[PDB]
Amino acid sequence: IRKKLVIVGDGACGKTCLLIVNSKDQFPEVYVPTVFENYVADIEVDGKQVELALWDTAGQEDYDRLRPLSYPDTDVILMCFSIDSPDSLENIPEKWTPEVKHFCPNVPIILVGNKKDLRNDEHTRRELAKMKQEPVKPEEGRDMANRIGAFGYMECSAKTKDGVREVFEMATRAALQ
Ligand SMILES: Nc1nc2c(ncn2[C@@H]2O[C@H](COP(=O)(O)OP(=O)(O)O)[C@@H](O)[C@H]2O)c(=O)[nH]1
Ligand SMILES: [Mg+2]
């Protein structure tokens, strides 16, 4: 019934907005805190009633120094990149995976691709095209999930709310395990 979630991944990949949406059911359009803190989510996940504490983290450089304090006792990690940022995805196996395996060796990981609303967005496609990039594809996220040993790969959009609910239900399932 009481479970701990930690969410990690590159600066600006949409972690805080994802937690705010899960929690308050509305995307923050103007103000967004660096970290959304102290929130316990009530989740029903079939059978029990879970209280899922949501522990947000950050970088932007020095928030680096505190992040380690987030991992004691976690039950489930959401490890994020954004679908508008091929760069964010390479950081998964390069940075976030070693960091989390180090601090939380056997805790289940859900790999999440955030900003799914941008995958056909015109300005995004233009901006990436100029670098000979394109939005991350679902196949890529699934194979990264495979590679790093994740419990599963999911996509969502905090902006439209599509897929958010399912992220937290699967994380809750994972944490119960
Ligand atoms: N298009 C779009 N932008 C989003 C989405 N989620 C967050 N953003 C924007 O992405 C930027 C970073 O968000 P934030 O949650 O602070 O990321 P954090 O540094 O990972 O916590 C902000 O400008 C958010 O509005 C999303 O689902 N879709
Ligand atoms: Mg943040």
Side-chain angles (χ1 to χ4, degrees), residues 10-17 27 32 34 115 117-118 157-159:
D10 280 7
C13 85
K15 305 183 298 293
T16 295
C17 284
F27 184 89
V32 188
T34 307
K115 324 194 187 186
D117 64 94
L118 296 173
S157 176
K159 197 158 234 242

Side-chain angles (χ1 to χ4, degrees), residues 3-8 14-25 36 39-46 50-56 76-80 110 112 114 151 154-158 161-176:
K3 283 314 175 171
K4 188 174 138 168
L5 182 156
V6 173
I7 178 168
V8 303
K15 305 183 298 293
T16 295
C17 284
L18 179 61
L19 304 181
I20 294 182
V21 172
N22 197 50
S23 296
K24 316 164 126 180
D25 201 30
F36 168 77
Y39 199 85
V40 181
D42 296 311
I43 303 272
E44 262 61 44
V45 122
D46 275 79
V50 189
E51 299 184 308
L52 185 65
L54 297 174
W55 283 57
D56 188 8
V76 59
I77 286 287
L78 299 180
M79 189 194 287
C80 301
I110 310 293
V112 173
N114 281 339
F151 178 102
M154 305 192 59
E155 293 183 342
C156 65
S157 176
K161 293 128 68 133
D162 180 26
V164 169
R165 141 96 299 188
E166 287 77 5
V167 165
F168 288 94
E169 287 163 343
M170 304 311 311
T172 300
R173 284 190 190 98
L176 253 8

Side-chain angles (χ1 to χ4, degrees), residues 28-168:
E29 309 281 3
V30 175
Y31 175 67
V32 188
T34 307
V35 296
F36 168 77
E37 315 156 281
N38 302 60
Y39 199 85
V40 181
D42 296 311
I43 303 272
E44 262 61 44
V45 122
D46 275 79
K48 205 38 152 293
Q49 305 115 39
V50 189
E51 299 184 308
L52 185 65
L54 297 174
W55 283 57
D56 188 8
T57 66
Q60 291 78 293
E61 299 343 315
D62 285 77
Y63 258 98
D64 279 347
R65 152 195 230 183
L66 240 259
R67 183 158 79 249
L69 297 324
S70 313
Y71 300 116
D73 291 317
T74 135
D75 304 303
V76 59
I77 286 287
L78 299 180
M79 189 194 287
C80 301
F81 65 94
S82 18
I83 287 170
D84 86 328
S85 173
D87 301 353
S88 78
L89 183 70
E90 185 56 35
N91 278 322
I92 293 291
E94 275 261 85
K95 191 185 167 62
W96 295 115
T97 292
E99 166 173 309
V100 338
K101 297 292 188 174
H102 179 251
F103 284 99
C104 305
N106 298 285
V107 351
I109 299 167
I110 310 293
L111 183 59
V112 173
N114 281 339
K115 324 194 187 186
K116 174 178 117 275
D117 64 94
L118 296 173
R119 175 179 276 144
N120 82 121
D121 172 86
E122 174 55 62
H123 172 253
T124 306
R125 255 156 154 317
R126 200 141 150 105
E127 282 282 306
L128 292 169
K130 110 178 169 158
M131 316 295 297
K132 302 270 194 154
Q133 288 171 336
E134 72 182 355
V136 179
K137 292 149 114 42
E139 306 92 275
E140 293 163 66
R142 274 169 213 150
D143 286 294
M144 181 70 72
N146 283 345
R147 186 158 142 201
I148 80 184
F151 178 102
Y153 168 62
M154 305 192 59
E155 293 183 342
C156 65
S157 176
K159 197 158 234 242
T160 65
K161 293 128 68 133
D162 180 26
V164 169
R165 141 96 299 188
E166 287 77 5
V167 165
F168 288 94

